Design a protein around this ligand. Sequence first.
Ligand SMILES: [Ca+2]
Lengths: 223, 168
Amino acid sequence: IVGGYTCAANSIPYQVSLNSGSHFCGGSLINSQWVVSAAHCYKSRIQVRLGEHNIDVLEGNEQFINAAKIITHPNFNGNTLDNDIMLIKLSSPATLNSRVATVSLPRSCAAAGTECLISGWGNTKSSGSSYPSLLQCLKAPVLSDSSCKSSYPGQITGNMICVGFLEGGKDSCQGDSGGPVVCNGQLQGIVSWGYGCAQKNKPGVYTKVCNYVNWIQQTIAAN
Amino acid sequence: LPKPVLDTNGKKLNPNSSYRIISTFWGALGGDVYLGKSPNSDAPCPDGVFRYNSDVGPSGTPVRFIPLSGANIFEDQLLNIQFNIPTVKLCVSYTIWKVGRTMLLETGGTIGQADSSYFKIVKSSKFGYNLLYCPLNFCAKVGVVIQNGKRRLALVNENPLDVLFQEV
Ligand SMILES: [Ca+2]
């Protein structure tokens, strides 16, 4: 998160860190045994870290749970970047409390202009490299499909949305991948990709979660 | 007036330093350049120039940039590219970039010779830089094709790969 702010501890209790020896992707807790993330975050072995605020210092009340099942979307293509969504089944249900909680799936798509909250542990520099230990936050509007398609001509499918600022300065970045874009208590976006970080007319691109609610509920109930 | 190529911290490129080649794109179309096995390649050593399918897993194989002369690295100046990794003598040449309309980038080249493959770093139309292959305007933009499902670097004069150089 470039140009964001440090979230108040445990104010984003659905946020998770995916760990493969190190933090590498965010995700969101949608029920006690399932996390949603981006497909480009697929890895054969994943440790899910819940209730995390400082990812570099074990406080004591985090939950570390290995993934039992890692399901990428069956029509995900890693070079069209379409259908960049993934489900992770926890090898044991997580304990829900004030630090670890679920976020609701969308019950409608989010209109342009809606204020959303993005969060993650990715880069905070537009150019260099400055990765935080503490979860970062940014409030940003959903952009119009018109302005999103003008910023990324010929790259936006019907399954992506742009969130952020045409002017630049505030944006998600490398390592926020797979993290949540929560909009009126509803998970509407998954950090997917961008061109540079917080550059003018280059907002972050997010998987449009409302296009996947059926797949999520059905894949969860079948596995 | 010669314009030095800059790393991701604004510092000019140094032929004594190592850099990862990173995508201007991040996330799902991030992915640093690395040295990989070409499909059905006879070499005992990895011989292809690839890039990862995302920037959330392994980091780039580091490279160095050998200028044909001087000790700076300038835009539009000829140079060779070599992955900088521990390897036995047999695979040294297989760390050195060379080119094999679509032409795949491979290793197996030589450095600073008449038979070597020279490249130029030029400013990108958007952010960052492109690499040019220059068989010594008649150079050729370096981009990506998909080969057995992997991102393989290749000559493509539509849609070059916009890159930055992050020092190791
Ligand atoms: Ca911690």
